[PDB]
């Protein structure tokens, strides 16, 4: 039975992470980061927020540098030894892509843009990417098998899929910049160096823009106004 910990989204509760992971339990810990495909424009930014927060947490933890180098040796050994701590990126509500095709007129280029960015981020932090949809029950068993594999060391056999737009699965060590270059071919207006915010825009949601606070003029101010009016006459 694997301990499960889900943190509140607000940073007001970030301090709870010390109760989730400790020095002894850190190697046993598997980190899962959620990427919201219903709001793709905040995916990368919130992901760097959470990854940063993990970085300050491990900074506070005060591990010996020898132990830190040992953990990095173990992790990188797991990295290059891949053939066809750990961090696992799971994309949720990917079926919202179908809405993006309609509501925001997205196309395969935008999907290539976001998934290339996400794969490059995974390479930056050496994580494993998987696409999921509870609404469609997509890759749930694949996810479960991969978690059991990475935690308990169980076997795993599913290959890496990077062709389907909303079912991309990339285990650790598979991705590479050259391997990521296949998506850059499909671009026709954007470039791989183009900014995320420019190409994919955060929509200005039409909240109820509250009206100005209308307040009755005070007796003194209204009467000074009337004094000004009478005086000029």
């Amino acid at each position: 039975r694997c301990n499960v910990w889900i943190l509140d989204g607000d940073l007001y509760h970030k301090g709870l992470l010390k109760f989730a992971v400790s020095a002894e339990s850190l190697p046993e810990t598997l980190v899962i980061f959620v990427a919201d495909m219903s709001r793709p424009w905040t995916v990368m930014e919130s992901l760097q927020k959470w990854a940063s927060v993990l970085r300050e947490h491990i900074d506070k933890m005060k591990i010996p540098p020898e132990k830190m180098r040992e953990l990095e040796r173990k992790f990188v050994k797991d990295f290059q030894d891949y053939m066809e701590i750990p961090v696992l990126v799971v994309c949720t509500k990917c079926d919202a892509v179908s809405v993006l095709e309609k509501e925001h007129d997205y196309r395969d280029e935008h999907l290539d843009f976001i998934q290339s960015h996400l794969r490059r981020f995974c390479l930056q932090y050496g994580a494993a990417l998987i696409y999921t949809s509870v609404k469609e029950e997509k890759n749930l068993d694949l996810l479960y098998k991969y978690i059991v594999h990475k935690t308990y060391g169980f076997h795993f056999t599913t290959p890496a899929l990077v062709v389907e737009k909303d079912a991309v699965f990339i285990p650790a060590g598979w991705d590479n910049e050259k391997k990521i270059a296949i998506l850059h071919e499909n671009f026709t207006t954007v470039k791989p160096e183009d900014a995320y915010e420019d190409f994919i825009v955060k929509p200005p949601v039409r909240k109820l823009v509250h009206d100005k606070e209308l307040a009755a003029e005070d007796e003194q101010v209204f009467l000074m106004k009337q004094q000004s009016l009478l005086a000029k006459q």
Binding site: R1, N3, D10, Y12, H13, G15, L16, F19, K207, L208, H210, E213, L214, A215, A216, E217, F222, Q226, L229, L230
Partner: protein, 284 residues
Amino acid sequence: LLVAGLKKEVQALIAEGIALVWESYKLDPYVQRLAETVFNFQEKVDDLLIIEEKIDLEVRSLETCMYDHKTFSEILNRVQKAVDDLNLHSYSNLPIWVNKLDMEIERILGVRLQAGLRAWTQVLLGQAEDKAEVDMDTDAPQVSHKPGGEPKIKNVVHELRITNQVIYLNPPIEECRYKLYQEMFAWKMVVLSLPRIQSQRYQVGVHYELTEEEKFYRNALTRMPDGPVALEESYSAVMGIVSEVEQYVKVWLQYQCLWDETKKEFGPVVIDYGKVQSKVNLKY
């Protein structure tokens, strides 16, 4: 703010009369006009003072009312009806005043929620003071219920059994961890699940987006005067009692190597080992 629209109307008619003169006979329709408008302004102001004091009393009650959802929710029902009357008579600036009152309500739900956690933490740790220790020399009646209430964490029991020379815990320290946090999650729903006051509730089918944080006071745990320290205290109690039970279960799991008081209590957590105690005695 609520009388802002009505007061300006009098200033407008006052502005109109400032141009009039006695030589015009427009004075007499104007005299009729000003009296009606001033008459309405007096009445609606009188209505709000009655309603606003009721709301002030009701929100004040939240500080001292009993710490249960029904007691809170009943109070939040009264304030909503008063606000609906304010919406019903078409007073100005109502969302602003409601938004101010809504903030004030969440603040009070902040301190009560902070008290509720600390009372719950005391109950979890065994530091909750029974009413026998409430000093009897204080002749003032303590009708004011405890701000944190009297949380009652139902006693938790786990099973330590041996099946074919294998010792296992039927309720795992992880399910104990699950249970203890679940009892806690009930307590925070005393406050966080309360209905959020809406200025335009009386408008039915209004095309305004409403999320859970809009629907309920789901953000009161961010309105605690002491910050997240009370929440951090609450979970810190859970780990320790879990940690001691993790330790206490470990020494019994050491006796599995024999093959390879009957119960103990950790606050609400209870471990029963009289069954395994017997077979350990025989094997030894």
